[PDB]
Amino acid sequence: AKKETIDKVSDIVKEKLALGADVVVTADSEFSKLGADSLDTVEIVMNLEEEFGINVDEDKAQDISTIQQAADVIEGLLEKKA
Numbered sequence: 001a002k003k004e005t006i007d008k009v010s011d012i013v014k015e016k017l018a019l020g021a022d023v024v025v026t027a028d029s030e031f032s033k034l035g036a037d038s039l040d041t042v043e044i045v046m047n048l049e050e051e052f053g054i055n056v057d058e059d060k061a062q063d064i065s066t067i068q069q070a071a072d073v074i075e076g077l078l079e080k081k082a
Contacts, residue, residue: 001071009074010067012047016040027068048074 006027014025017034025034031041042058048070049055054077064070 001068001075005071005075006067008051009044009048009071012051013044013067013070016043016047025067027066027071030066031070032065044070052078054078 010025010027011020013031013034013036014020014023017023017025017036017040023034031044036044041061041064045056045058045061045064052074054074056073056077061070061073064073
């Protein structure tokens with residue numbers, strides 16, 4: 001993934017965990033540590049899929065733990081295009 005993609009995802013994720021101004025999310029930050037439960041994570045991929053117009057199964061995003069992890073799955077899909 002790229003530094004640009006991480007910013008996009010983090011923007012959406014942090015927005016779901018907070019307003020974004022009172023929260024601090026990074027590539028090293030874990031969705032579980034940020035305060036995102038199983039009900040939150042599932043929503044993260046949903047908001048992202050609609051953003052990048054991509055699609056991914058939850059069972060496939062299991063390994064996903066940090067922002068970067070979720071960024072790799074997304075950035076990896078957009079590449080499939082063309």
